[PDB]
Symmetry: C3
Subunit: 145 residues, 3 copies
Amino acid sequence: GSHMKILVINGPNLNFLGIREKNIYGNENYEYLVNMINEYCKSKNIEVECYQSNHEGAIIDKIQEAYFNGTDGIVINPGAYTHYSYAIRDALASVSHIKKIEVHISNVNEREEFRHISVTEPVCNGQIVGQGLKGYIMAIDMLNS
Amino acid sequence: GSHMKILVINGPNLNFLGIREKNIYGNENYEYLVNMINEYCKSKNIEVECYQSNHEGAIIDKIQEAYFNGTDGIVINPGAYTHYSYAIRDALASVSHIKKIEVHISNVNEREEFRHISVTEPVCNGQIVGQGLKGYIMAIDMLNS
Amino acid sequence: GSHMKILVINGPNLNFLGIREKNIYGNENYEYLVNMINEYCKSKNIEVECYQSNHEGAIIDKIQEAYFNGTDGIVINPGAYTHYSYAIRDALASVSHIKKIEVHISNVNEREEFRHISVTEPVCNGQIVGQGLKGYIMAIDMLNS
């Protein structure tokens, strides 16, 4: 379309930014993240929707809806589903014409052992981790490059 | 009841048949599969409902509803949940008077390593894989035997 | 508040108590369990809500709602999600001011191998297993101690 269209998906527990450990996830809340993304995309003439759900199936539904509605790119932080949701992986793989960047706020490589492997990342075009909330901006830049 | 009653459950991403890789999943879409099942069951005087959801919990809800509504048999392709949903496994096991056949379209034994083991199949009465869409017909025949 | 407030969460398949194997799960149904909990808490001047869902995301939603509504303690039997839902684990960890007790009806240590490890228990304050339905009462007593 006339402007790039991006969907940002945040998975379970990410609506509790701020409430969760600030030394891991930073001082700012989910509303702050949404506003940051919205303002950045407006400054770049990018259409963006920020979506969050705790439900694995709703995330898959949202990815499928992106197939039909002109979405060019997805930025996704699957939350803990990153490490086990082969269903979200297959959803991401099913939208073969949508570029996808996986984001994690923290450096998941140095987190608990269960966070070290992502089952969604192998079907994504890229990824970013360990940059704080600005990782979402960096992911948008990867899609807009 | 007067005719056998079957529920066909398709799990996450199976509504994207056709859109997904045709050399894996075949040329035809989910509507085609539903129609194929419906027509076959009509020809055999079998009552059938085709259901699909991306939500693990909705699949479990649907299995539980089958307990109360006279369902004789379930054909289920759990999608990627096959490999990790012990919750769907326990749901299938909980309906001890309902015969169950697991279906996969592709030969999951020769897929990615994560697809090689099914955690749902040990509580099913049978299974079929690698036959394409006709595996669903074969599963119906197993239930109707 | 003026009385302790507890939320009891039962995960997938626990609404099928009674219907499931009685030699594993006991003779009594889910309604019986709810009534038992309600009566006990009334006798102790404890406010309680019993909640059940088969949906991983609804369980997470319910845990998050407990943050905002004055809940003091959660008793949770995550069902099969115990063994794989890092998303429920992170939800429980996110409510750092809510005491949490994990319950299992059966002795999960002597169940199938896949039931031997709980991924939710490391973020709970306690746990109880193998006591039958009275484990829920024991969990309430742990919270009320």
